[PDB]
Design an enzyme around this catalytic site. Structure first.
Site, PDB file in Angstrom:
ATOM      1  N   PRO A   1     -11.560 -48.376 -13.879  1.00 50.35           N
ATOM      2  CA  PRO A   1     -12.303 -49.406 -13.150  1.00 50.35           C
ATOM      3  C   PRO A   1     -12.794 -50.534 -14.046  1.00 50.35           C
ATOM      4  O   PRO A   1     -13.000 -50.329 -15.244  1.00 50.35           O
ATOM      5  CB  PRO A   1     -13.456 -48.734 -12.446  1.00 50.35           C
ATOM      6  CG  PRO A   1     -13.305 -47.398 -12.553  1.00 50.35           C
ATOM      7  CD  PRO A   1     -12.042 -47.111 -13.333  1.00 50.35           C
ATOM      8  N   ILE A   2     -12.973 -51.717 -13.466  1.00 55.23           N
ATOM      9  CA  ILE A   2     -13.431 -52.885 -14.209  1.00 55.23           C
ATOM     10  C   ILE A   2     -14.638 -53.495 -13.510  1.00 55.23           C
ATOM     11  O   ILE A   2     -14.533 -53.978 -12.383  1.00 55.23           O
ATOM     12  CB  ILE A   2     -12.306 -53.923 -14.365  1.00 55.23           C
ATOM     13  CG1 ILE A   2     -11.131 -53.326 -15.145  1.00 55.23           C
ATOM     14  CG2 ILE A   2     -12.826 -55.174 -15.055  1.00 55.23           C
ATOM     15  CD1 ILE A   2      -9.913 -54.220 -15.192  1.00 55.23           C
TER      16      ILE A   2
ATOM     17  N   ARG B   1     -14.206 -50.202 -17.970  1.00 54.89           N
ATOM     18  CA  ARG B   1     -14.518 -51.403 -18.731  1.00 54.89           C
ATOM     19  C   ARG B   1     -15.609 -52.185 -18.013  1.00 54.89           C
ATOM     20  O   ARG B   1     -15.611 -52.277 -16.781  1.00 54.89           O
ATOM     21  CB  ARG B   1     -13.277 -52.279 -18.923  1.00 54.89           C
ATOM     22  CG  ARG B   1     -12.435 -51.883 -20.123  1.00 54.89           C
ATOM     23  CD  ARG B   1     -10.949 -51.996 -19.830  1.00 54.89           C
ATOM     24  NE  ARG B   1     -10.171 -51.010 -20.575  1.00 54.89           N
ATOM     25  CZ  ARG B   1      -9.653 -51.223 -21.780  1.00 54.89           C
ATOM     26  NH1 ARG B   1      -9.833 -52.391 -22.382  1.00 54.89           N
ATOM     27  NH2 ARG B   1      -8.960 -50.269 -22.385  1.00 54.89           N
TER      28      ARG B   1
END
Lengths: 57, 57, 57, 57, 57, 57
Positions: free
Chosen positions: F1-2, F39
């Protein structure tokens, strides 16, 4: 609503202050949503960080 | 198309100028879209503002 | 590097796959960065959500 | 200038069309920028994807 | 604070609800900010729109 | 995931370092995803670049 506007650097504090209010009003009018629920984020871009057609603006 | 690339700070003006053009060309090629319609936004992140696995890069 | 590319919907999975690879190779080239460290996000836009000059393009 | 407006889904195409035009005119007014140079992105949010205070609003 | 979290689609509403609350509590903790002032946006990514190293992950 | 978190400027390096880790942990816990795949991007906003209800914070 949450609006992020990417604009080129060089504007003054007053133009960006007008930008936040007028855009928040336009969002509140168009969506019939409470003005207090509208948030606006201004993101400035340096001239070397924005391109049009593969070239710098 | 509108592309925003998040990159770490430290690159020179030339590498970022090459980044905008080569990415805009890759977008124009892959989508058969006019190069002039492609816009690229470069967003620099300080080392203390980007994390990988909960730790700083 | 992280890239988010806003495009109008309508492209096939094969074209959007080409877009991810060509852009990632362009980013890795211009910044001399590891290809595996480059991530690309495709965000599709409906024809009713994208405007140019206040008019839906 | 490029504007991305996050809104909860549910509005009609006519309301989201009004939102694009009123915001573009507001941006062009505050910055004295060419209207045709202003682009607006509407990003709809499902009720299950937006939270206020850790609670889904 | 405003958080936008890009995730691959496929999670249930219960998991994405847990994600909004746990992240909001984490943001409020680290910054000593009012929980009610924290907003979280979940942006789902199709498997065809996310790439790692130019390859669809 | 960001995850990209928009926060007001003024925080110290330590609070933002805690923010990245605690949020990445909350994302890894809530989604049962590897912590190393998470991140986090911290984006600071000047006081003149963030509005609530059409007014500056």
């Amino acid at each position: 609503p949450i609006a992020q506007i990417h604009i080129l650097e060089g504007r003054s504090d007053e133009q960006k202050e007008t930008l936040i209010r007028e855009v928040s009003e336009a969002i509140s009018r168009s969506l019939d949503a409470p003005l207090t629920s509208v948030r606006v984020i201004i993101t400035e871009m340096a001239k070397g960080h924005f391109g049009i057609g593969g070239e710098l603006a």
